[PDB]
Ligand binder design. Structure first.
Ligand SMILES: O=c1ccn([C@@H]2O[C@H](COP(=O)(O)OP(=O)(O)O)[C@@H](O)[C@H]2O)c(=O)[nH]1
Ligand SMILES: O=c1ccn([C@@H]2O[C@H](COP(=O)(O)OP(=O)(O)O)[C@@H](O)[C@H]2O)c(=O)[nH]1
Ligand SMILES: [Mn+2]
Ligand SMILES: [Mn+2]
Lengths: 775, 773
């Protein structure tokens, strides 16, 4: 009791010691503004305008205007004084306009601050430079404007204009560069490659049958080409990248902050016909418009902005979409434009995607495997598809379209994920639209009342920098095969539109039906690819080792323990690896398990290298019958035949070992990880309750969306995995190698015959259409 | 070319503030209101939080004068008075802050003065019966917002409670954590607490069995404080808030007004609320309600409760329970009786049961949960309380005396909150995902203190278990996820009991014996899925295939069905397990109710047929002495303990339902648990801002990477250990060589649990007579 009394006594001493003048406080607060509070006040005004509170929006607008008007006087930097004075004057003009609008002397719908584009001198210039002809206004001045347009369809309706439109020049070919958290060297390489393309376009000889004629002639082509660089978020772009953009005279943080205070811009446009010099050669000027967007979005949203806003503004003749860090050959644009002009029927084209410096760093197995995969995918698949006038464009590939089969329905279908929220669409459409450039491909192919096909250009080589690590490749294939496994399902489900709506020729529709049957067979085979690979390895290797079917070894008697031990070890290792793959995939992100993924990949690697050696052994021990040699050459050397036919066989000769070492890891891991993922207080209280109910409804909608997405993905993954497992178990238990290996050989031979025929058709078409152009 | 020329001509025609080196009319166009006053105040609070003292005062005067002008126009007398009082207080705080800035008054970390406001309660009952009450306390309700970021300084910042102000010194102190529940659970909990207080009141005096001291009759309600702490005002149920207003404890108007510029961290509402049910008027109950704005954890609610309020009023015993936990009339009496008579228990745990077991007997999930609760309580709690160390069940109604929980145990409990979990790691994260048993271990192994624990059987606490298998999945997802790392902690740091704590030699020897048993039990339960699969496979299917079921002769048969049974069982089990891990480690187990129910039913009828063949195998065997001994000791241990403790009818009713849910239980729950200035200064400030944002994002992603990697590594270890063990025993051991081993292991575990239950019974029925010695 004594400690309790002592503690309460010290507490009682504790409570004693507003406890635990207005004129003086009034004098203190009365006793200058600043840029920080001015910017905060304009930000609050923009928020109020967004929330449609006009009285307090106005009240916060004149305060900020006068704050910057007073601040501009005391600043020391003349450019800062000019920027703040202009901002204050424009804000006062907008305040007067808003006051008049509220008074009603002028009637207008949805008032917004007037669109003001400002041109500030570029900090850095090269006095020693060579150019055909350029005006001081365009050359020296850098133009920037902030845009609020939420629906890029109304970008031109809100008075936004580009420097090309203002000077009256008419761009025809127009390229997009979607950049996000990329280093300066990638942008520098991309811009240097584009400048090289423009220079090579200039160097076309006039009066030649092969050379292009028209708006793409020499000495005047750079004017007709506009490059649009659209970033994904100002909070995610690399600081070194922004430093590079300032160095090339295209970005200014000070100007952006000053002139984007009260506008509440969704994205910022910087326009500059930037010129570049590399060593002693000076690149020709390239027209560049840089669209830096405020909030983080997706590549689909970047394309939404690009396509809708700028394309509907300037009506380009050809529209090109390209990633960041992709180096183009000198003649990539020439080949694209040549194909477009000579065909006058192509709705869209895809360039060849390759790996930068394949020969260099040959010690890296992942790089060589990716190079082999790119080369085989391009040659075989793209040739076969372009023979049929329909391309499943590789993600990230340098692709272009003509803005005549893209203007309407294909773009609406492409952007319907953004326009209509995916909750109504469902999870199938969302997974469809993770990668939808191929959706654009299909929509252009199936345009109503239009027969616009596609074409794959082998000569338009686009060199990119593929990931050098297995985890980066895993993430890449997480995106790629998903888009893929869903746009494919779209293609089967909607192949009827090509005949129901589009007006193709009868022969074209028959060819499309044939390609549809082939595509069904190929997708069905690739769906059971893990099961088929496991069965092939199991049967051939281990049931030749156990049943003495390897014609180079004699395992008739042996110890009888190792014979079954090999099969048991293989089955257990494969099953354990697959289960670990499920757990890790579906589980955590594939970056902290670099060691585990490398271990599993190496296990599969030596597993298919020993498989390759035993396959070569049985092949060489076989007496090489006519049928056997025919099927073997057709199924294996199809890659070498196509590569030698097209010219690039050395890449395959160098990378086939690296790819076949990475084949099981490739299929298993990548597919499994892809499939694995002035009111009063009563009004105040009512507003609080309404906001709370809005938050609750938003949370319930988000959780319902997540529930639907995860349920759909788990259902599709369970279907895929259980189908593979059931197929493998059933064939293992009810079919021998003699009854299943011939079937698998016939299936793979049919697919490889189709791909060889496609590549041969592409070659003969591209080498014979020139002479037979008259007929 | 014509369309392009036409389009450009159209743009030229459409192109009419218009589209280096008037204002008077707008000014003339340019009264206050409550909304802008609240917004202004609010920011002022944000600026003060950002240490913008030079700005703060001006917005504070703006808000103060805004409300000073607003209060006159309000027609509501109570709103007018409240706004006028808040404006006067805000102006006083503004003057004090101005003096502090001028420097005439020097103070550290200025903050608005803490003031408690007493408004009359909307609802009062004229007709009531009570011993004695003052009009001030009964008629009026007090409230105060708190800023204390570290609840350790609750008393330092000047916060006082009505008990402290009136001089009442609470001794028993009981917490009720609440989050997004409905009014009926709170009403049931408060009615049960009032019943407990009534039982404590009507205890006869001058009796050996009856309590004596501060818990006597007619005055017990004064000495007990109820602290109900919510988790977030954005998550509490609207109906719950209406109930709190009805009982005179909550006010949206008062909270919004008085919390405008304080930037409080939680809101305290104090009201000795009186409740009346039918013709019986319940005795008043001292209740303090702490509502915090931002969603937090039950650990954070306990942080607030323990640190702030316990360090303020220094209770003799502190107690913790959830909402929806109906306590019997004698639960509090039994807790206090045990505490007073022992003077050695550092913390106690009450029995957890299911509300209305007999009713709704058709619900297999309810019956299985009732069986699990009963057997867990009896066996595990009795065995653990015999050794004076309880792994308290999560959500159970537990209490600790505030003498072995004051310091180091509480610091160890809250260290996850005090120091960020990035330094601790994922082990400590899933360690403190549930740590009531962490309190248990710290109390047991507190340095220079030997405070054991005691499980009270008679203090029955009835809760409302989920009625759906998905709800049971989520419950077990929390429960044994915490429990596994709890056993890991106890296993790793069992050396502290001998190195630091000063227990008796016999107590340390008993603790060592229990440690050996706990090691064996945790090892057995780690391989529980593998052991269950082996038992089912061997017994059922290798008796069917090898003709070892003594009630049937399958010697010849068709030779196809014999292998077909084993193949079907293996394939179904493997497919079920793979689907389980995927569904478990993928999507949230609430959209897949059909799939989970299908797998659970498959396992259910599977163990029904397993039980039928076992019974056949137990009725066709000549029942030798060894066989009957092992079988009774391994199976009827539940019935023996239940008959010893008197609660055998529950087992008789729910054993079939539980054995129908054993494989789902063990497989699904274990899998789903283990499976989861100028312009330059402005620019520099922006650079600091998004650099800090990037650093925080990197830290969060690194924390997530580490936690997920540890989770996946542990899950891989568990699953692969189970699979390797199962495959090895299947391929290298027959049933005749592994069934005896499994029977001996389970018999040893059940013998330990039976001995613990019997010891608890004999102790609780013999310690009374042998109290002299
Ligand atoms: O959220 C994102 C991620 C990327 N990108 C950009 O859009 C393209 C997507 O290609 P990415 O490099 O992501 O694909 P990959 O080459 O990694 O397979 C690239 O230009 C990215 O910089 C984007 O706009 N938003
Ligand atoms: O984020 C949360 C979730 C719950 N709770 C509360 O803390 C206890 C957690 O027990 P839970 O309801 O999870 O267990 P159950 O009653 O479901 O078995 C309950 O009183 C919850 O209302 C909390 O404070 N914070
Ligand atoms: Mn890229
Ligand atoms: Mn509960």
């Amino acid at each position: 009791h004594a400690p309790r009394s002592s503690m309460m006594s010290v507490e009682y001493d504790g409570i004693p010691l507003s406890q635990q003048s207005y004129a003086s406080a009034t004098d203190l607060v009365r006793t200058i503004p600043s840029v920080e509070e001015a910017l905060s006040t304009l930000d609050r005004a923009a928020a109020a305008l967004n929330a449609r509170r006009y009285r307090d929006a106005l009240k916060l607008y004149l305060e900020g205007g006068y704050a910057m008007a007073n601040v501009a006087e005391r600043q020391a930097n003349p450019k800062i004084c000019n920027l703040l004075t202009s901002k204050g004057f424009e804000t006062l003009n907008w305040c007067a306009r808003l006051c008049d609008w509220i008074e009603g002397r002028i009637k207008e719908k949805h008032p917004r601050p007037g669109v003001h584009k400002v041109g500030i001198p570029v900090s850095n210039w090269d006095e020693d430079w060579v150019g055909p002809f350029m005006d001081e206004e365009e050359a020296r001045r850098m133009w920037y404007t902030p845009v609020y347009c939420p629906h890029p369809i109304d970008f031109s309706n809100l008075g936004y204009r580009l420097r090309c439109v203002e000077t009256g020049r008419r761009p025809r070919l127009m390229i997009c560069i979607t950049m996000y958290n990329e280093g300066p060297q990638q942008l520098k390489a991309t811009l240097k490659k584009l400048a090289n393309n423009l220079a090579y376009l200039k160097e076309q000889m006039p009066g030649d049958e092969k050379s292009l004629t028209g708006a793409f002639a020499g000495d005047d082509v750079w004017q007709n080409v506009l490059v649009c660089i659209v970033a994904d978020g100002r909070e995610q772009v690399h600081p070194k990248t922004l430093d590079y953009l300032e160095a090339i005279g295209l970005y200014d943080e000070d100007l952006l902050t000053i002139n984007s205070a009260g506008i509440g811009a969704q994205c910022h446009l910087f326009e500059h016909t930037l010129q570049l010099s590399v060593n002693g050669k000076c690149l020709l000027p390239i027209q560049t418009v840089f669209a830096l967007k405020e909030n983080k979005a997706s590549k689909l949203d970047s394309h939404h902005w690009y396509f809708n806003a700028f394309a509907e503004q300037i009506q380009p003749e050809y529209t090109a979409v390209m990633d960041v860090g992709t180096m183009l050959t000198k003649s990539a644009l020439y080949h694209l434009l040549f194909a477009f002009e000579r065909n006058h029927q192509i709705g869209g084209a895809c360039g060849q995607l390759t790996v930068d410096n394949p020969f260099e760093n040959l010690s890296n197995w992942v790089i060589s495997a990716q190079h082999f995969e790119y080369k085989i995918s391009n040659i075989l698949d793209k040739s076969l598809e372009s023979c049929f006038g329909f391309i499943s464009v590789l993600p990230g590939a340098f692709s272009a379209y003509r803005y005549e089969a893209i203007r309407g329905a294909p773009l609406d279908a492409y952007f319907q994920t953004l326009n209509i929220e995916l909750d109504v669409l469902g999870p199938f459409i969302g997974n469809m639209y993770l990668a939808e450039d191929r959706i654009l491909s299909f929509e252009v192919v199936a345009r109503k009342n239009c027969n616009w096909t596609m074409h794959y250009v082998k000569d338009a080589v686009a060199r990119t920098d593929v990931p050098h690590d297995l985890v980066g490749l895993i993430s890449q294939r997480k995106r790629w095969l998903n888009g893929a496994f869903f746009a494919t399902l779209f293609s089967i489900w909607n192949w009827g539109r090509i005949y129901s709506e589009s007006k193709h020729t009868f022969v074209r529709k028959m060819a499309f039906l044939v390609f549809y049957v082939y595509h069904l067979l190929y997708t069905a085979f690739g769906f059971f690819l893990p099961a088929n690979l496991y069965l092939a390895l199991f049967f051939i290797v281990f049931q030749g080792f156990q049943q003495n079917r390897l014609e180079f070894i004699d395992t008739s008697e042996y110890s009888q323990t190792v014979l079954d031990c090999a099969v048991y070890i293989y089955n257990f290792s494969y099953l354990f690896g697959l289960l670990m793959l499920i757990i890790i995939g579906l589980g955590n992100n594939p970056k902290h398990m670099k060691l585990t993924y490398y271990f599993v990949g190496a296990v599969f690697g030596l597993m298919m290298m020993l498989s390759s050696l035993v396959g070569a052994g049985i092949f060489f021990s076989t007496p090489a019958t006519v049928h056997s040699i025919v099927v073997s050459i057709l199924t294996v050397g199809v890659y070498f035949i196509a590569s030698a036919l097209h010219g690039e066989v050395h890449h395959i000769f160098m990378t086939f070992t690296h790819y076949t070492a990475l084949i099981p890891s490739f299929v298993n891991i990548f597919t499994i990880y892809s499939f694995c993922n002035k009111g009063d207080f009563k009004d105040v209280i009512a507003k609080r309750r309404a906001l709370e109910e809005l938050r609750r409804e938003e949370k319930e909608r988000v959780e319902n969306r997540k529930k639907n997405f995860e349920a759909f993905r788990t259902n599709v993954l369970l279907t895929w995995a259980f189908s593979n497992l059931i197929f493998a178990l059933f064939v293992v238990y009810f079919a021998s190698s003699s009854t299943y290996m011939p079937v698998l050989y016939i299936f793979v031979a049919s697919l490889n015959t189709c791909r060889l025929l496609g590549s041969i058709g592409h070659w003969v078409y591209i080498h014979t259409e020139g002479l037979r152009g008259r007929v």
